[PDB]
Design an enzyme around this catalytic site. Structure first.
Site, PDB file in Angstrom:
ATOM      1  N   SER A 185       0.825  -0.927  -0.200  1.00  0.00           N
ATOM      2  CA  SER A 185       0.135   0.177  -0.204  1.00  0.00           C
ATOM      3  C   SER A 185       1.055   1.191   0.058  1.00  0.00           C
ATOM      4  O   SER A 185       1.741   1.330   0.794  1.00  0.00           O
ATOM      5  CB  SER A 185      -0.994  -0.348   1.418  1.00  0.00           C
ATOM      6  OG  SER A 185      -1.665   1.272   1.686  1.00  0.00           O
ATOM      7  N   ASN A 187      -0.141   3.724   0.832  1.00  0.00           N
ATOM      8  CA  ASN A 187      -0.924   4.619   1.953  1.00  0.00           C
ATOM      9  C   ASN A 187      -0.531   4.045   2.680  1.00  0.00           C
ATOM     10  O   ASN A 187      -0.940   4.872   3.910  1.00  0.00           O
ATOM     11  CB  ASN A 187      -2.797   4.801   1.504  1.00  0.00           C
ATOM     12  CG  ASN A 187      -2.342   5.410  -0.179  1.00  0.00           C
ATOM     13  OD1 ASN A 187      -2.089   6.590  -0.222  1.00  0.00           O
ATOM     14  ND2 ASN A 187      -4.153   4.723  -0.738  1.00  0.00           N
TER      15      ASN A 187
END
Ligand SMILES: Cc1cc2nc3c(=O)[nH]c(=O)nc-3n(C[C@H](O)[C@H](O)[C@H](O)COP(=O)(O)O)c2cc1C
Ligand SMILES: Cc1cc(Nc2ccc(C(F)(F)F)cc2)n2nc(C(C)(F)F)nc2n1
Ligand SMILES: O=C(O)c1cc(=O)[nH]c(=O)[nH]1
EC number: 1.3.5.2
Length: 368
Positions: A185, A187
């Site tokens: 990810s 994020n």
């Protein structure tokens, strides 16, 4: 052309133009939860079926992680004609994620930017949802042989990433057909990553030990066998670390690799110039395909691949396989093309397989 699909796709086309991305998503997931979505009840071509080791997929299309993060809408998503779903990415404890609005779309480019920051109900509640699905699956003809994988990850502020993935395996492992390791990810360190993979396999095998029941009752899952282990990889990497990861996967005899997650390395969208987060959709197609080729090289065709994303058509799908992708995951396609995505893409790939000369899907895996 199922009338029901066409009717919903008008409402969805409307929702896309006007409503917030995530609010739509939640509404449709909510619709599916109360079982008011269309079914694809058709027979899938035996010539288009596929597998990763002893994990058999009735067709080569599933739904990627981050779609049904909490596993609240598994039956209905599956019944749109998908062979599998990958729920999560889940974390040990519930998270709100980042600040809303955190997902934005662009029709013109068929792309999505997001920075969810791993929102989910937490393992306990998601395991509770998966159990409930697994019960239904025993009493539903349309859910037989359908595969459910679980994407696991860490909390935003975790002490050590390994300790989290163990807790998840301990709760949900019993009910997963496979586990997708998420550390991709927007994020890792070869040995740091190697450590993780071995932790997972070691942790899964402990579930078989501690039980006094036979495996058949051990696996309340489609396979009835222990979860396979997949790892998901981010595309924003050097030709160097891509080589370094490939050996680690080979040294751990990992069951498969999901290529790939979202990118930050896209600057050429005028509406995305504003926003922050990882990017998915059509502009990820070509970048993601090269990645598969690359990791197929540095792996000597030994570790099977799950493809994602940028996949919208049977054509798009075929590229991934010729490149050597065994199976495909869709996310962006369900947002732009809609509920017919599975029916449409399965058809398109069946046609193309015949015209290219291939006997079955498996013959097309890894052919330039
Ligand atoms: C809103 C959103 C949330 C996502 N959440 C996850 C996630 O939690 N875990 C994960 O591995 N991938 C996640 N993804 C990435 C997808 O699983 C998929 O790999 C990616 O979107 C590329 O495929 P696509 O272009 O066909 O959508 C997410 C993507 C989007 C757009
Ligand atoms: C209209 C719409 C629908 C939707 N989500 C959605 C689309 C199909 C289905 C299905 F299951 F096929 F019925 C379920 C949910 N999203 N998701 C997003 C995003 C990118 F912000 F995550 N924008 C959306 N816009
Ligand atoms: O939860 C998120 O923000 C997220 C996770 C992931 O793996 N990929 C992504 O694009 N977003």
């Amino acid at each position: 052309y199922n009338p029901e699909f066409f009717l919903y796709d008008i409402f969805l086309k409307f929702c896309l133009k006007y409503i917030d991305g995530e609010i739509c998503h939640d509404l449709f997931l909510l619709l599916g939860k109360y079982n008011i979505l269309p079914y694809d009840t058709s027979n899938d071509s035996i010539y288009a079926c596929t597998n990763i080791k002893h994990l058999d997929f009735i067709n080569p299309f599933g739904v990627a992680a981050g779609f049904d993060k909490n596993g609240v809408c598994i039956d209905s998503i599956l019944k749109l004609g998908f062979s599998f779903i990958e729920i999560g990415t889940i974390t040990p404890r519930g998270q709100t994620g980042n600040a809303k609005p955190r997902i934005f779309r662009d029709v013109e480019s068929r792309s999505i930017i997001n920075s969810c920051g791993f929102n989910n109900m937490g393992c306990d509640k998601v395991t509770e949802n998966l159990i409930l699905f697994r019960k239904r699956q025993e009493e539903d003809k349309l859910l037989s042989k359908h595969i459910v994988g679980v994407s696991i990850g860490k909390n935003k502020d975790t002490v050590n990433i390994v300790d989290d993935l163990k807790y998840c395996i301990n709760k949900i492992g019993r009910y997963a057909d496979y586990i997708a390791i998420n550390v991709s990810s927007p994020n890792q360190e070869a040995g740091k990553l190697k450590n993780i993979i071995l932790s997972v396999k070691e942790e899964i095998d402990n579930l078989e030990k501690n039980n006094i029941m036979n495996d058949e009752f051990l696996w309340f899952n489609t396979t009835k066998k222990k979860p396979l282990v997949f790892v998901k990889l981010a595309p924003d990497l050097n030709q160097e670390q891509k080589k370094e990861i490939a050996d680690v996967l080979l040294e751990t005899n990992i069951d498969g690799m999901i290529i790939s997650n979202t990118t930050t390395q896209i600057n050429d969208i005028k509406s995305f110039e504003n926003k922050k987060g990882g990017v998915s959709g059509a502009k990820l197609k070509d970048i993601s395909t090269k990645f598969i080729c690359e990791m197929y090289n540095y792996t000597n065709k030994q570790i099977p691949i799950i493809a994602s994303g940028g996949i919208f058509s049977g054509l798009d799908a075929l590229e991934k396989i010729e490149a050597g992708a065994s199976v495909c995951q869709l996310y962006s396609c369900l947002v732009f093309n809609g509920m017919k995505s599975a029916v449409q893409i399965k058809r398109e790939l069946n046609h193309l397989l015949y015209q290219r000369g291939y006997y079955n899907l498996k013959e097309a895996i890894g052919r330039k």
